[PDB]
Scaffold this active site. Sequence first.
Site: not given
Lengths: 323, 247, 247, 245, 72
Positions: A88-91
Amino acid sequence: CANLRELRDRIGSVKNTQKITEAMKLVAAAKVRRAQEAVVNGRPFSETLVEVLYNMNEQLQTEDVDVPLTKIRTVKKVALMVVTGDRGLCGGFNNMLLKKAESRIAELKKLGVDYTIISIGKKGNTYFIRRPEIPVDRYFDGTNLPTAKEAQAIADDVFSLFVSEEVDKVEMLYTKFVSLVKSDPVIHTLLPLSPKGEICDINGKCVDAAEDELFRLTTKEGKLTVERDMIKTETPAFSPILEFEQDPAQILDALLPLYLNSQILRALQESLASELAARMTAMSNATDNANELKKTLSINYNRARQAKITGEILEIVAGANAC
Amino acid sequence: GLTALTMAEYFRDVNEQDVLLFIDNIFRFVQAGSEVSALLGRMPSAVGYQPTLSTEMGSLQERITSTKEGSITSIQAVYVPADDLTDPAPATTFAHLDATTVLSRGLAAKGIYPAVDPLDSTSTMLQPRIVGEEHYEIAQRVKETLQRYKELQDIIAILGLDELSEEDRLTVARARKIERFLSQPFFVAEVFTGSPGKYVGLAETIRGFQLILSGELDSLPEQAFYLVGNIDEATAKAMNLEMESKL
Amino acid sequence: GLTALTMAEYFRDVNEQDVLLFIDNIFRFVQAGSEVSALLGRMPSAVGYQPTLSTEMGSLQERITSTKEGSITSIQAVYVPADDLTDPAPATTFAHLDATTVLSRGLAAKGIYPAVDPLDSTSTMLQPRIVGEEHYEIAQRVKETLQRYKELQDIIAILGLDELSEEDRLTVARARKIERFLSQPFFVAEVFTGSPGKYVGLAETIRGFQLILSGELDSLPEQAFYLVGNIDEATAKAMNLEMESKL
Amino acid sequence: GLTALTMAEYFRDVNEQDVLLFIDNIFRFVQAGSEVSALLGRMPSAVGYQPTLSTEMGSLQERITSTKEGSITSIQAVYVPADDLTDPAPATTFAHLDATTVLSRGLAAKGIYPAVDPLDSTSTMLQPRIVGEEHYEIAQRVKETLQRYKELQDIIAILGLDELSEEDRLTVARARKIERFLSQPFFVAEVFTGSPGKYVGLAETIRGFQLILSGELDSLPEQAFYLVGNIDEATAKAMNLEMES
Amino acid sequence: VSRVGSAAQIKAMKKVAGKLKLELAQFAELEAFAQFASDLDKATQNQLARGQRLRELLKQPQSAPLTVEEQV
């Protein structure tokens, strides 16, 4: 007090957020380091493999009537595949990778290829299964570690997909690990394999084999950063005699799937490292930004506390006399 | 507070000697002033300290000045309320303070006595035209090195000293040597441990810190720098450990 | 308030019967005192109430005690003004009140009626020897799960719902199901919900919370727990909802 | 303030002209009231002001009314003290004024002059029958864009811009283009800095805002619209920007 | 900011000071914002190096004022 208390809540929540994203930064750094250590573990095997492949192509001068994994005679149906990271949010990872994917599948539909697409990350396949306009099937997942069995499953499926000449020119979108800030997702051809061993690119930075890239994480003046090692593995060309137990053709037909599996596992390992480093630089940016936010919110809370208490005291003192 | 002020002011203006004056928390003095003004009934100012806050605590802290007889340099504890330098009493105090050195609980728990935080402690007297160009340069470089160490303390937890670059692994090692060299055995810690204690003037610590940070002592063990005084005594401790290294 | 208290005190002195008195908006019994005290010459106290807040509030709320001829159970509905939980008019009533039930606007925001805070609504009767060991352990697990949800609210709010832990995701789903399930369709609030009122004793809701938080029936949809009388009603509501989902 | 008002009132009520009076810092009138009525013996009021901060300033505002003879287009640069609108001296000003524009310090800190806050500045004249349906709908759309920008400001806080999905990213880019375009090199701020002033009519800015909100100008970077006038001049500025590289 | 603006400056310094203020605007943007990854525009090769040089030129020594022509 419903005015100061809200700001105390936001101060506490932003401080806890800073703590949590700092923990995620250190966790992502340890994960990048352990993926780098897995790559360093896998490097002896690939070294001896890019030496042995040169050995075989030195005995036979690419004189061969064999090797289905080098049927390079058309461009009929490309099978582009993307290795994506599952977090999640994975850059800024997923948008970049599937953006390169959408650009290249549009450029492939220009040529009329009926591109079938293999997804490797669960984030990837979740994006892919929403839109079937892109012809996509056979999505798999290996997360937190590229396991040899999962890379072998990918190897099995792509090799069984190439044993039919339905699918040729199997190039892949693995996100190589150039820099900590942003790692651009490159596109490399995989399966034709260029039987001299050299795995080549999208025509303009294509790589000669045995010139390998092994990324190393060392600190600069002070920060975390990745520095590449363009180590060139020397090759003892042949054993003094070099008997064969097999034929010169069968040995290559049994060897090139092995190098295919090695390259698939490398394109999972470096993709995983690049994803976790994108998530890590997102965590570092988020932690420093939450530090700035905590400082500014503490300043606002302090001036709010002084204003509240001063207004209180003025109420009290001015209502005291009532002359 | 004023009683201490005049009991030290007579000392300086009769004997011409560098008198010290330790006040316990100035915020406690300001709190007492707030109580006495609220008791007098004069209308309270901002957050609730007295109206004559600046004038009162200025009368307290302006008689602390180096007259031509001899200095009356003081050391004043400061307890900020809810930890903000913004509110008036710490504000009108920090308008006066000329050097602020925080004692760190983590450093105390480590045992780097004195627990004064080397990084966050600041002084307006650090500037070069005041101390000396060499003192300002070596002080700025020590603070930048300790900043590098506070940065890389995040990352040596993950990578380790040998994994990261050997360019600033020397910085980490020198920062260890600096943080250890800062701990001085006092003339009072003898009653707790029996360490005899060393007094270190500015010249000795200047030359020692230049020798550490320049890099001549890159091979001395870290614990040879801990709880030692001058740099020569530190090298004596190091060669002592070397003489026992055979056994 | 004192008129109602005199009626109850007669019913506890003479009839010797356990009279249940209800006072609502007891905060008005302090606000009126403020509005008359300001005029009465008595100086203003903190944020604007009367100076004799504590004595007057106690003079009301101390007469309500079971006094060996009967038991006056009373339920005051304090008005925490503008959700000022620190305001003196509820802050001195929290001292007198046994089973405080702090209703929260933030929990009526998402529609969960009654908007009683599962955390802050606490009682002097949640001791195990008084309530039952099973009751105490299930209340402890519910309140701990809601505290976990409140501490993971910020992680949920910013960093994406999925990026927290997977067991903590189980805890978040369990907390969501709990904080919906503790909603009651009232008989007198049937006009606002549109659903008929349902009365449930302590035993049925105890057995419901057991199987809800135990993870055994963690597969139902969330809206099948919201505004539901009982756990079997929730199971039937899940059937109805999954049927009308596809149909 | 009263003598300015009477001077304008004689030229409106009697000689029947469209008098304009630009009473500058009408907050200073209320603060002078605070001074005098702290020294006049009258009892103090909210935070510091006179008790009659809504009747003396009422007397100032209510005499400025467009009577049947003439109209008084008054501008009053009322000054919020300490940058909070909830203060009573401009709070009583909000109730009387009908074309309120709040010059937040945020936009001038970022450099966008004028610093008129685009959310907070409202009017009673932003009405369908008053300004036409096109002006109304464009005003509504740009207010929506800037409001969604300010509402996910809490997300382009701690996290990054790249956390957003595609539509959020596009509306953020559009909001940045708009918030930049709302700046203008004034015709009187030539002394401080900036280009000579560009007079912008409604029929020209409405077209530029149609253009930006129609997404057709996505090829341009944000610095194109910053401190420019008309949108054709903005596109020319972007062309020269890419030429200069 | 100075509300008297460039009207109070010298006819000599006005042009070069306007150019310098615009230079610092460019550098402040390029430093406070993106281009930490190399880039499309690839600063430190157009404006970032010169802006850093300018901003670190702006620092004076302690109580050593520069004359008019010197600072021009």
